[PDB]
Ligand binder design. Sequence first.
Ligand SMILES: C[As](C)(=O)[O-]
Ligand SMILES: C[As](C)(=O)[O-]
Ligand SMILES: [Zn+2]
Ligand SMILES: [Zn+2]
Ligand SMILES: [Zn+2]
Ligand SMILES: [Zn+2]
Lengths: 331, 329
Amino acid sequence: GDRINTVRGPITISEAGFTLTHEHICGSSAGFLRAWPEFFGSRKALAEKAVRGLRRARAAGVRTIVDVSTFDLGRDVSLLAEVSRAADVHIVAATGLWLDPPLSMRLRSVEELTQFFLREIQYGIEDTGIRAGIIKVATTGKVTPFQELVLRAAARASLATGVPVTTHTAASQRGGEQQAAIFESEGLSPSRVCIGHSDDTDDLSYLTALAARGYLIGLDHIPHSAIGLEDNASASALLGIRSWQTRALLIKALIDQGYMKQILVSNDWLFGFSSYVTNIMDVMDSVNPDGMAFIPLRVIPFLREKGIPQETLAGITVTNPARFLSPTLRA
Amino acid sequence: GDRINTVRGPITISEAGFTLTHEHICGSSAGFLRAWPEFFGSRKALAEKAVRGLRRARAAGVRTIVDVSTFDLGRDVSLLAEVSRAADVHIVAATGLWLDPPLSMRLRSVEELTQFFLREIQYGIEDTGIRAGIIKVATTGKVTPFQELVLRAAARASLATGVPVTTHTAASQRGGEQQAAIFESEGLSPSRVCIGHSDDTDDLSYLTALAARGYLIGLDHIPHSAIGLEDNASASALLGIRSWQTRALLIKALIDQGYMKQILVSNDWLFGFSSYVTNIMDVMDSVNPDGMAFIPLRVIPFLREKGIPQETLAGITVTNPARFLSPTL
Ligand SMILES: C[As](C)(=O)[O-]
Ligand SMILES: C[As](C)(=O)[O-]
Ligand SMILES: [Zn+2]
Ligand SMILES: [Zn+2]
Ligand SMILES: [Zn+2]
Ligand SMILES: [Zn+2]
């Protein structure tokens, strides 16, 4: 109803405040942080870096982040709880599956996957008793048969619990349209779904058409940009070469079209990143030293400068995430 | 030098006894047992099944198993330590990588992989202080570029520590030849290497040639013969069409060639198996109700009746594993 799960327990949605709806503490792989912590220097070093970063985000006004790391992104909810408590920032944990499921997940049926997502929402993650407040799913442009199982299981878990679904897409492939079709074939309301990484495209017809159907639009890659780093193949492939201003103007664009209630904004940042080339984190941190504070420190003023009312910005950063995260469906 | 690391700490070579050199407590995926234990009923149920299975094997003469589950096979060394202590059977843990590395492993350099294998051997696995006593690697027929990195990292870790390397091969594609070539390019002695799943072929010339170069030959799929399951659409690509006796005779064949010193025998069994289709464990347990006791209860007597002397059988099951596992440079 009006309470959501965080890694410190249930909170009322009024307490969430300024919420970043797509972030990561650490982007990794199942088991990896605990098997090889010195990849990140140490577990302690990683935790301290996350606490420093989250504390700066809190100074800048952030009160909640949603960590959309799944099992196969190496989600360690014990780490999430430790850094949440120390930074005093709410963290919502995720269930679901991203793009790197191990065999023990890849070979499961839609029914089995449904019961796994329900366990993480209704019972707890691992043996921690920490419950997920969101379901994260990911597809390639053309959805694979396994990915379709994952989306149907996510829809079924969402209908049984009321918690929302948020996606990874290839926006240049208009990936959201095939995702939306599968979700609706399962009876899932578009108001329970955020189509993420949507600022990766400048195709406003695609974006507005999803928004008109009641989907939430995740403009969550705003600081991702390898401009100046064109000589870095791996960084360019990851971040793109569109400017952060270009990405942010899509926020204005969707407001101007009348869809401010459908916008969710985030940084998609992280404090460690093992599921890409070595030292990618140092490259990203040089691009955006603000980290997760990039949205409140850079983007919000940029948009106010362009004339967007304060009330509108507050609605996008506070009201929209609250409506989205509040469990809404079967009691 | 003459101490072997187990999940309960170091043991002397003489303590190892009858050793099964390729086994699994649970074939899974990294993080999976912790995240979804009810897939196996419960963690408790899996543990209890494994303790009964190990005690059965112990009553059939087994004293040590080598669990060749890697990180990406969901190795949980805390589970191994628990079941080892309750069954009074030594378990040697593994490092290395099998065929399901996640992105955080697949994108690593040979230098990075070498350091991870070294951490698990020299420092410990996770935060447990339990050190690996063997390095497990796997390839599919024609070695992929990443698999080649794994094999080279395994060779370098072995050379720094004396710990042996054991492999998963496609024997029908003669995959050991490519593995050996890579190991030798690194300066690794063949006597530190077991080429596994070798009973999956009838090509005796292929096996003898490897043995003559000094490789250990892992005849570890003996009970994966099934016989009777052609109605199944997932128990013929995992299990066999040749009888277990046929596989077992390869042991005798190699003995007769004068290579009994080169032979390692095991079951490649497990007590849980999530990295396959659902309910596979039920199929497997019905086909081989002996589990890890299949080697001592069926294969040893079969060889004895074919005229292999006790002393030779003890050499294969006690002496060879001890020489293989004892860290050596
Ligand atoms: C963990 As990601 C690079 O898919 O947002
Ligand atoms: C874990 As296996 C079936 O490759 O020996
Ligand atoms: Zn993503
Ligand atoms: Zn992300
Ligand atoms: Zn194998
Ligand atoms: Zn095996």
